[PDB]
Subunit: 310 residues, 4 copies
């Protein structure tokens, strides 16, 4: 059974202009990440535009990633959907594709409750009991916060193998790590931060890895950062993290007075990837807004200056 | 070309204990509503547990409703999904089933923006330009508020035929009606309230109809209320609305210390329907919680006292 | 003791350019309101810029209002402050000035809880047990919602004489009225809406009165509206409310891309009052932003068109 | 002019049973903090129950603190109030008492706007231009977030001397520090975290200090933590922060089913009474009291995790 620790980017989905999955570019991106030093891949996560792809498109992207990865690193599959029956359909797809782990959120659109969230995860686990199931804490998208007491209960019960926490709340992540360790659940329950700019903080508190969207652009930077942290080189880690945080400025280029943070952020990532020659274009799924030729030039300049070298 | 005004309940989905669609009970429910005097049916809305049903189950419920209705009243179809491509798949299902209208929300899960919401509705309309498209304002579930200026812009362009507003903000609904009328868009853009307890207010302000979940339980009450409002009998309407609001107490019976508002509310509705002999049981989709015997007895008592009598 | 029902505007505070209270204009405003047919005055409410006035300035405004009113209508006094001891200081001021009622909010700035909100109101009441104490529900400013069950508990105990509800949620106001009536607390606990645009709705549901900011500008319109409602002329009431709602557009003139809603809204009211010759100028307390000549011209045109004629 | 960096706790206000300021306990607390190694004191902040104290009580508490401090460390004064004119009254009080700095928030209760927030701070500055003015970012209480571009504009203009950030968002604080340094405003604009449990993170990112409520209870722990961070001993710092974070469990003892202020500040005062620094854990109205069982639990946490 695969173990999901270390640097595990949420793989993006390159697209053609007509919105279909750009399989050739997706293969190039997978190679970019693996040869960049990542420890695993998270397919069909938020930054993979999972919420934008149809079920059929998700299946194609997942299969493309798993087949091209060819066992080099483990691949975990997102099963993001509103409620349990719909998530379990995606679990079946994931098993069919040979996924080595699952990533699920709380229910959304519907009102929910900690009791119902817990049942949700238990029933997802039961659909694929041999796969490590990670709980994806992402309040900006699902509008629930995953109760840390519930998570540790499910860890103890063997229902959850870990969590990917994208709440942006490092104090809360730290508290969860401390609670986990005090409960003696350190080895059983992996804690991955979704942070792109406070990865050194997470490792200093004893987190097990990172799922950074920006890791699509600069996988080598995050690999190098994790290595510094694991070697206890905290000052050096902080200096590298600061440079990564200046690369991160690509997500702030797009004018959010007329587009969402997804358009600006994921668009900035894809723009960088196209500039680096990894994918064919920065095409986005509907209804994402395009970046202007001026915005893309600014993104290029940032990439040129702050992409990691060593 | 079908016109969606008047009392248009969001039809529930009766279920078997194994979670499958209870087709026989769904047919009985359809007759209950139509014989109760409603003016149309909204299939695959929030109260139909659309977020809980798989795409295949949605297709079964929609087809069951349309075929049993047999043209007695028009049927509009929810196409609720996270983003545009996924919504358009459901539009395709709706056309295949012979739906006579469409109901869509803003994008959700993903971050969004008014610019992206507008593009979303335009693209949905383009997928079925001959069907009336209604915008469904439901901030509690999608966590965007539909910009009323954008809605009227889309109405003027023929993209939107109306809106179903479940925001619970009657001042905002009133302001939108006023702006519509001042823009000369009164006939082009129907405004339906999703309110169950302030339907008289909406009609007094010139709304075109109502989409009340409780209308599943007591369609005759809402038909009677609409008629009083249409006849300008506002005092009589307020007295009936007050009685309806005491029937509505069935949604507050379930103890929300261990269940969601959906479990308590929709569970309350289904418990009432089962008590009235319209559907086989109050089975809910996973991960809804069950109501206790004490809770169902309280629901029965409320139904007995406050169900409509002329 | 005085009874606070009917039309009770939150009296504004006219200012000199240096920010001091314009006593002469405040007297003219009091006459404008009373001769406009109002049933009471609410001094030192939100629309009175209570949050902007020093304790000394509040005392001056309050005393000016009470003395010029000369017993023509009852005056209730805001005691808006963060927590209980600070509120009780203002209760002492109100007693000194001869106020005939008190209006208090939940605690704010500090984190709070329903248990603490309840204690807060009990302690305020204990400082002036012979004055009617109204609870001011204004979540946009205090970021708590007053629990309706708590409110009725305090009503039964004789702690609260009523509530002024500015939540903008007419469904919730209606539910509270229904709960009050079902508990047999109709006479004991007055329910006043802070709505400016859905006053007819509130009266239809059996509210006792209205505290409308726009009532400063057009007291006669709200007096006329209340009378129509009390006479059961609901269609005529709705028509008049619609005209009032177009007068209300004065609050939307100010460019909120460079001011607050308070600058645009209260500024709009003061601009209208200056236009009507009631107050010297539209001077606002720091840090409100000023309205442009273009904006004031637009406000003047709206006032000319939609002001009520008795 | 005073420099507000390092460990600067928001001094609590001990009370008598009737809610009046307990000046003898307040003096003992001030000594507790100063002898515990803090670098400054923040009087009349949120943890000082400033929102609960009347203007007259704030004056008494501030005077008591400044006089007992007797120049040993600098004292900055909170001037927390809804809007500008009311804040400036408090600025006048602060000058009268001899405060050496000011801490202000955005306007609250009233709706506001970045334009009005900026005018607010400029006018507060003009009322006492020789005092360092720190902007207090505390969205949980004022329900505005201070715009970091605005803060740096004000820093460049000499209106703001710094910020105390209690948003709990370490990524956002880090971004502000980076933006400050990139704009060449490092020396002019001090950035202090209000975090109690991620102080080492803040120092790793180059923050100038910390304003921790729990620092009332264990000033020596935070003084030791800051020293480790300044010495670049990050592994040792993280280990000490972890211990501090277990002491912090005292704020989670109170049953919040019947506020966080009651549980949290009540937890602190319970610890201070247990340590003999203040007379009792009396809280301002309408705070709820902690039960015997709850105070016993707080005592046990203090006994185990207090820094030695």
């Amino acid at each position: 059974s695969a173990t999901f620790t270390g640097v595990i980017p949420p793989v993006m989905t390159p697209l053609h202009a007509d919105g279909s999955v750009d399989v050739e570019s997706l293969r190039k991106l997978v190679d970019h990440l693996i040869n960049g030093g990542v420890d695993g891949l998270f397919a069909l996560g938020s930054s993979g535009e999972a919420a934008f792809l149809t079920r059929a498109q998700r299946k194609l992207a997942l299969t493309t990633i798993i087949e091209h990865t060819a066992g080099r690193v483990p691949v975990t599959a997102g099963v993001i959907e509103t409620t349990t029956a719909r998530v379990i359909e995606l679990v079946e797809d994931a098993l069919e594709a040979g996924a080595e782990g699952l990533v699920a959120t709380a229910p959304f659109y519907t009102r929910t409750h900690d009791v119902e969230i817990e049942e949700h995860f238990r029933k997802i686990h039961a659909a694929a009991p041999e796969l490590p199931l990670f709980a994806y804490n992402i309040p900006v998208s699902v509008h629930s916060n995953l109760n840390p007491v519930m998570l540790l209960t499910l860890a103890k019960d063997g229902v959850l193998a870990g969590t990917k926490d994208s709440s942006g709340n490092d104090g809360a992540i730290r508290s969860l790590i401390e609670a986990r360790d005090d409960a003696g659940l350190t080895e059983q329950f992996k804690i991955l931060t979704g942070s792109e700019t406070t990865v050194d903080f997470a490792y200093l508190a004893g987190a097990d890895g990172v799922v950074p969207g920006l890791g699509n652009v600069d996988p080598a930077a995050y690999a190098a950062l994790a290595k510094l942290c694991l070697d206890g080189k905290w000052a050096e880690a902080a200096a590298l993290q600061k440079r990564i945080n200046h690369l991160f400025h690509i997500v702030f280029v797009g004018d959010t007075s007329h587009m969402s943070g997804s358009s600006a952020g994921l668009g900035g990532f894809k723009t960088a990837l196209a500039h680096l020659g990894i994918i064919e274009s920065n095409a986005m799924a509907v209804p994402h807004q395009s970046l202007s030729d001026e915005e893309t030039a600014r993104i290029h300049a940032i990439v040129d200056e702050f992409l990691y070298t060593a």
